[PDB]
């Protein structure tokens, strides 16, 4: 260890040092705090170079204005800052915005290695597409997002073979709402303007709610709040959206100027939350270029703070944040507004709603030819072999193995012969890839690619299996209830579980959700039942007249007994509906075959022989949930099994809650009844032209 160079007494700084995990991070915290304590970190007064008295505010907008052909069309530098798994949606958007005359510079979050490999294949095909060799971990609200933009601006200005006129930043959840031709016509007319949107409210309230008067430090992929600071004197501070369009002259100024304004603002915003939401506004309005500002970023942002402000980033930053919602089909009419010029919108998510994306793409660039496959489907990779089984969890690894075995048993039973069965397989190694599969915005299950030996010819084969969950929601004669579901990682903004498969292990903490229709207020009862009829929890909920979704995480002692749980909803003892979910036993511990003592410790129910303090044994007779002494002992025996016996217990559970819909081969096969994966409608190997990138057409487009 090592003591600080200063006495540290601020509550925020002490709370940060206590929660920080690495020695390097604790040192950086102390160093930052000390320097600010002595007044050597933040500037207190900054020179203003703008001759105006206040803001500029420039222009009158007519739809026909953007239908001319420019003699000198601008060439655009697109900077794409992307993360996550949605490579095929990114490919579709890249297809919509591509033109051979523009330029594309793609920064992939350091933590998204799968996506980076897919982007690399794009940059290798096209000479006007490059990827940043440096990669940052751009957490939400982090100071590193500004460092990302400023470094990409320096890189782009030094690429003398790319003569660009405008800088436009986009994420993987953006999409154009007007053609490239109209974008170029508009910007070619206003090439000396800068497009930034301000908050549109009270400026004092903007500063407080953004935390601009607080000192932040990014370290260990977290934003630590370290105390207060003053807004420097002599300049107007402003901000709004961090999505903008800036012309080359202003980017040159920000990058290379050494005047008092740029130097001190780069220092100030190195320790600022959400810095890109106000750094560029503050510099521009106080700089010599202040009279070039248009208070319009040419974007439609789907803000719905009723749903998007749930302080959902509290584990990443020491502050409460918000974010915009995903568009749905009913929002299409908003893209046709004429009040102000707009060319892009956000956010779009294909795993949330793809229909609106299709509507928008065909509206801008026309339908695909009749007979085009995959237009209503979506595939998203959630595991890729090069990232290693340690990037998975014991839960997902266990279940992905089980799904593969479920497919191999499907192949064997699907061949009807009295001779040698040439569709019997023995599994080998670990899954090569896993995909989510959607059709018409309905989740279809998982696709698992895996290797196996065909035992008839004794040869290795590569296969893909489609597994789909069995329907388990059941309503009963009696109503406002529409659906009930159990899962983890509930997304309060989009109102869905981000653990799409509902994959759960004994150490997971399930969440119960209900979906309601309109009607008067009502109160219902919720019952959780474990695989041997033990009632784990009971509670009543009020369903207010305006309620649409409700959810609750019951406090259950761990581990949960493995098997099929049941959740019941009653109304004054009158049954309403029920649902089921699976707590799967694990065949892996630290990615290794589980050992007897850890199997027994993990699969024999909770420690205190009870899930909560209060008991509900008084309810088993009333609800007809008798506890069978034989099943209880059998569950004890199951809890001590390993190897084959454990594999047989898991696979019988999985088979009861999942169905192997189909299985295909990627290459040659000896099984006479299996299609080639490329010939199927469902395989991740089947044609998907809406997300495929080919040769540049005569008009310079890919779409």
């Amino acid at each position: 260890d090592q003591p600080p160079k200063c006495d540290i007494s601020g509550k925020e700084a002490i709370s940060a040092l206590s929660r920080a995990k690495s020695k390097h991070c604790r040192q950086e915290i102390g160093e930052t705090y000390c320097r600010h304590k002595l007044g050597l970190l933040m500037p207190e007064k900054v020179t203003r170079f703008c001759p105006l008295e206040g803001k500029a505010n420039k222009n009158q907008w007519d739809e026909d204005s953007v239908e001319y052909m420019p003699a000198n069309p601008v060439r655009i530098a697109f900077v794409l800052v992307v993360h996550g798994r949605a490579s095929r949606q990114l490919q579709r958007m890249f297809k919509a915005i591509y033109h051979k005359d523009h330029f594309y510079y793609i920064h992939v979050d350091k933590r998204s290695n799968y996506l980076h490999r897919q982007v690399l294949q794009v940059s290798r095909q096209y000479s006007n597409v490059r990827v940043t060799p440096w990669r940052m971990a751009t957490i939400w609200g982090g100071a590193s997002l500004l460092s990302t933009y400023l470094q990409s601006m320096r890189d782009l200005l030094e690429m003398t073979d790319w003569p660009w006129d405008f800088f436009i930043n986009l994420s993987a959840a953006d999409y154009p709402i007007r053609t490239n031709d109209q974008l170029v016509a508009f910007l070619s007319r206003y090439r000396d303007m800068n497009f930034l949107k301000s908050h549109g409210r009270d400026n004092a309230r903007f500063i407080r709610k953004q935390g601009l008067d607080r000192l932040f430090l990014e370290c260990d992929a977290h934003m630590w709040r370290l105390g207060d600071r003053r807004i420097p004197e002599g300049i107007a501070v402003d901000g709004g959206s961090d999505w903008f369009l800036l012309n080359r002259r202003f980017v040159e100024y920000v990058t290379f100027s050494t005047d008092d304004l740029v130097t001190k603002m780069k220092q100030f915003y190195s320790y600022t939350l959400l810095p890109a939401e106000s750094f560029f506004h503050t510099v521009l309005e106080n700089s010599p270029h202040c009279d070039t500002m248009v208070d319009n970023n040419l974007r439609i942002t789907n803000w719905n703070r009723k749903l998007g402000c749930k302080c959902q980033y509290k584990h990443i930053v020491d502050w409460c944040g918000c974010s915009p919602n995903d568009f749905k089909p009913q929002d299409f009419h908003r893209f046709q507004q004429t009040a102000r010029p707009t060319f892009f919108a956000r956010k779009f998510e294909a795993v949330v709603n793809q229909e609106i994306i299709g509507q928008l793409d065909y509206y801008l660039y026309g339908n695909y030819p009749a007979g085009t496959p995959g237009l209503r489907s979506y595939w998203e990779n959630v595991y890729d072999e090069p990232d290693g089984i340690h990037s998975l969890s014991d839960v997902t690894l266990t279940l992905y193995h089980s799904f593969a075995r479920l497919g191999l048993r499907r192949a064997e039973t699907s061949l009807h012969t009295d001779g040698e069965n040439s569709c019997r397989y023995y599994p080998m190694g670990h899954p090569a890839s896993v995909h989510l599969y959607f059709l018409a915005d309905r989740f279809q299950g998982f696709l698992i690619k895996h290797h196996a030996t065909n035992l008839a010819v004794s040869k290795l084969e590569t296969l893909e299996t489609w597994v789909m969950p069995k329907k388990v929601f059941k309503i009963a004669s009696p109503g406002r209830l529409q659906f009930s579901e159990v899962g983890t990682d509930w997304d309060a903004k989009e109102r869905l579980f981000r653990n799409f498969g509902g994959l759960l292990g004994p150490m997971d903490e399930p969440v119960g959700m209900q979906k309601w229709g309109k009607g008067p207020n009502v109160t219902v009862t919720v019952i959780w039942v474990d695989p041997v009829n033990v009632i784990a929890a009971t509670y009543d909920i009020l369903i207010e007249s305006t309620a649409e979704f409700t959810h609750y995480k019951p406090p259950l002692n761990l581990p949960l007994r493995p098997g099929v749980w049941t959740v019941k909803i009653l109304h004054h003892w009158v049954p309403v509906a029920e649902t089921k979910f699976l707590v799967a036993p694990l065949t892996f511990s630290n990615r290794q075959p589980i050992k007897p003592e850890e199997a027994l410790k993990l699969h024999n129910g909770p420690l205190r022989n009870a899930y909560m303090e209060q008991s509900f044994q008084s309810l088993n007779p009333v609800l007809s949930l008798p506890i069978n002494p034989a099943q209880v002992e059998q569950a004890r025996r199951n809890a001590a099994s390993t190897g084959t016996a454990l594999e047989g217990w898991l696979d019988s559970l999985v088979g009861g809650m999942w169905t192997a819909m189909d299985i295909c081969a990627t290459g040659p096969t000896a099984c006479p009844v299996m299609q080639t994966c490329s010939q199927t409608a469902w395989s991740s190997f089947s044609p998907d032209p809406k997300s495929e990138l080919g040769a540049v057409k005569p008009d310079g487009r890919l779409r």
Binding site: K197, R201, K209, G211, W303, C320, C322
Partner: peptide, 9 residues
């Protein structure tokens, strides 16, 4: 259509 992602402490 107000802008800004911060939502207080």
């Amino acid at each position: 259509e107000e802008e800004g992602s911060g939502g207080g402490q």
